[PDB]
Assembly symmetry: D2
């Protein structure tokens, strides 16, 4: 099948990439980074997130595999010493949900797809937004920002903000607060919120309309913003799996002991 390999760029990941290509040259495999069937990421989670956004236009034709040259990553869960055994076996596919973000401007829409999370923060001044859940006004948020996480992203920024860890078989999204103000006049829910499919969470500005909006590792300053809509995407990321590595085991090895 057609395949490609991306590398972290350091000495360890580049030469591991060249050896897998050589191993692939001994089979019916064509290296094609335009229309690959298999995308192998050699490096860390940030290297994997880059590989995902590289091919976000062909998600339903691609199965991703991650090899962790540094420590263990949640998306890169193959060790380098198991690379040759990986070449040979190259199985079943597993799918994780994704988050769809829509940004509307006063006076052309822009949509984005997130594998970890999308966050909103102020352009420098204070951050005030109204939070609207399915056209019903839920709260007015004053604080540092908000974070909307996929299931597989709940172990990332979401986890540092007090959010729950969520098994990736649950099609959902989770909203966490970043340092909300709560006193006699300002009031937020103060708990993470977990939304199912077809629920739309909208963020609407109260005064300032410039926001720093992130999607995974990308962060862009958006101006003249009127609304930011979140919902569980209809698209999914597909992984190539060759052995049982359960999510809760991977959580254990990354946070408890390994």
């Amino acid at each position: 099948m057609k395949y490609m390999i991306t590398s972290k760029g350091d000495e360890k990941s580049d030469l591991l990439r060249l050896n897998m290509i050589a191993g692939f040259g001994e089979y019916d495999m064509e290296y094609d980074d335009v229309e690959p069937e298999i995308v192998i990421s050699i490096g860390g989670d940030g290297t994997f997130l880059s590989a995902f956004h590289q091919y976000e236009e062909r998600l339903d034709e691609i199965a991703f595999i991650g090899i962790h040259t540094g420590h263990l990553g949640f998306y890169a869960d193959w060790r380098p010493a198991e690379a040759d055994k990986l070449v040979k076996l190259l199985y079943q596919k597993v799918s994780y949900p994704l988050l769809k973000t829509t940004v509307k401007y006063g006076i052309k829409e822009a949509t984005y797809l997130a594998l970890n999370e999308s966050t909103v923060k102020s352009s420098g001044g204070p951050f005030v937004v109204d939070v609207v859940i399915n056209d019903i006004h839920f709260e007015r948020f004053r604080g540092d920002g908000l974070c909307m996480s996929t299931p597989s992203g709940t172990t990332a920024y979401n986890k540092s903000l007090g959010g729950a860890l969520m098994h990736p078989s649950i099609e959902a999204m989770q909203l966490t607060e970043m340092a909300s103000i709560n006193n006699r006049v300002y009031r937020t829910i103060g708990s993470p919120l977990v939304f199912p499919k077809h629920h739309v969470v909208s963020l609407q500005p109260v005064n300032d309309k410039d926001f720093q909006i992130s999607v995974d590792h990308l962060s862009i300053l958006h101006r003249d913003v009127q609304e930011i809509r979140y919902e569980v995407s209809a698209k999914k990321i597909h992984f190539a799996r060759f052995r049982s590595f359960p999510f809760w085991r991977r959580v254990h090895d990354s946070f408890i002991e390994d």
Copy 2:
């Protein structure tokens, strides 16, 4: 249809109950508290939880309705002044997931059904249990206790322990920690965990085998315990709904402003 009405027991709830029975006497309604089709709870959330466990053996034949005589309850979401309009209309059914708890003793099983949560605490001494997720050892918990919550229960004990709020259309359960110890030798995940259907969480004792186990308002001291198993139940609670009162709106009215 056959119906019954339970009351908080105070003056307000008893006479509201008698007036609804009189209103029901003007229709083809039979008061039957042995095999009711409709169970109306007049009082608070604790009154509703009592009504649920009253008829936990006939959940698939019963639609529950709650009337809040005190403040607004998450399960009792009808005002007393709307009682006569409720008698007449007596619709669609909505279903919430439930939590199944299995307690095994050394040397007869015992199962329970929870609408809010089930919690485990020590019998007086220190609380130490091993947490096993789908036969894989996840962590050894040292602390005050653990809490396993349904979706509709996430706004109850779960919320006070830092857990996420979870829409009840998600068939899941959430585990929160009660004051875990974390230092150089003791280590827990420290985040709430959200499990899907068919995932089994088992709690196994390390030394002491006596535990205070709660299921909603009930709390019993269990002795010679070998295991406590949690999983999303196959049974569901069915509500009779007559108008749109979304979960996120009900969360807003109970915690933000009303």
Copy 3:
């Protein structure tokens, strides 16, 4: 005595300022905004913080008074209707501790004084600093930022970040974390830290040396930073008090009920 009055700038605060000046014109009072003995702030807490930094060079000769035209402020604790009674009485002085911040650059020092807090965040990239307590390396922090709060500032940014509320008679400073990363390789204390006088907390960069450093409402991007030192200042802010308004009462009225 010599005095001055600063205003929020809106219609309510400006005309309340003019009426107090007229009332002061009926006594032995000289309006002097160069060397005042009394500084009256009419507006909110942000208006008060501006008044404090206006005269941070003459703190030991000035007693501050705050009048809250909007809601109740923690520093502006006089109601507008009590302005004429305030003119007449114009007592004892009470003193609150302050935080001293020292910023050193590679290749001229810069010092600052904070009434609420001082915070450090990254210039855009990831935030990594080593935390040194009295020349002993305590931890390497990876996250969004850190916050060092005075006692009276513990109800402000500090409170939103999970910090403790600290009575202002305690000469101390409190360090809170902003979304620290904690996994198998990255580790922080995760608890607020409360330091006494003469303890010096130093923050040292690991890679990037550009930081967004805030002191109360001011926030400046600092470049070529080598160290950021925190310690309880030797200077104190002095308030003019005319009646008993205890700190814990003021906390109650601002967060519990009023």
Copy 4:
């Protein structure tokens, strides 16, 4: 001088105790467990807490030393291999603040002294108390319980409940909440509170007057309780120190890395 040695009771701690007594027999030392000048605790922190309460009536005549046979303890900060060097040197004294607890019954007072903390929980039913700070009603607490911690106790139960870590040179006490209820009708401060000397925190029952009250490792069910008063004690615990082992270093070795 007069001295005594208490042991954890296991094989390691008993024979280390006998060897130190033999080493002490080669000097002008008298083993006296009635009126000791020096109290050596060989074991863990719980062994040390037992030693403290053993001699709480003669705190101003006793200097405590702790040897950790198991892991490193916050109070037992001497390694077993350094026992003979400890015998010879047997210096300066350092003092840590303590917490005084007063329990009043309807229809004889009872006072207690705590080195870690004192906690209040319900006798089985729901826990509701009014919190009074210096005769001013602060809040009505509904939840699982409350915890009042000394500075050296802030790394113990206090830390697990979200409290701040507090250097023991600060004469203060810290109150943390155990799973408070917060909704439209019930409201607590939700933040840890740090009190200075001479501040009195009183807990008063609302309905049930039976409480489970703990002081360090002791926990007794108290009945017909009218009030529970907390304040920084006038008594202090004195340690014998032979080398520099700073508090923040000890925190680092116990929670970060060792």
